[PDB]
Amino acid sequence: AETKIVVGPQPFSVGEEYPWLAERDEDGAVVTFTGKVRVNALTLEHYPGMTEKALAEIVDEARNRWPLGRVTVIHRIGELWPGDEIVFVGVTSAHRSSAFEAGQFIMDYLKTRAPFWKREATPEGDRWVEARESDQQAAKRW
């Protein structure tokens, strides 16, 4: 019933993460989500003493709501460009319904509770990306 949580600048590879996530025979349904930066560079400011802890607390809550197997959550920091992979969420369960629902929940809570802030380097200077009301409403449904 292990959990992998990683926060750092290094790139990740879905092909390297998938084999461990899907290894157990009892984990019969496997769901992954990858999010990419959506031309200006972005930089991700963060709260180091809290980012890993916040991600772990979201997965702990998911485990109390659904019967989950192995779980992996990775979030990058530093300078990134459109098309670069920024976040990975991998979840397993006995049935597809729980795996899909837990993946959605983990992303909705990550986007409203994990301490990361995007800044864009535009032609006129750095500008902070705006938080979205749609993310607040998505999180409130759980």
Partner: protein, 81 residues
């Protein structure tokens, strides 16, 4: 003492990344009001209705109690993922 950290726009407006305060405040809200009262820039940074707070690296209500040795953080709505 209590250690207070700031991030993103909040950090930029208050003008420091971190500071220390004596443990003379019952709650996060009482501490927020004390810091807002230091200057017009500190009031603008800390009186926003969407401001978030953490105590010992967990998100909490502004009614959360404070204790000597705690780490408190104030920051705006998050934009990761």
């Amino acid at each position: 003492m209590i250690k207070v950290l700031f991030f993103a726009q909040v950090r930029e407006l208050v003008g420091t990344d971190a500071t220390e305060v004596a443990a003379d405040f019952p709650t996060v809200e009482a501490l927020r009001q004390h810091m807002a009262a230091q200057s017009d820039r500190w009031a603008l940074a800390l009186e926003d209705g969407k401001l978030l707070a953490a105590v010992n690296q967990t998100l909490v209500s502004f009614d959360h109690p404070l204790t000597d040795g705690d780490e408190v953080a104030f920051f705006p709505p998050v934009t990761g993922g």
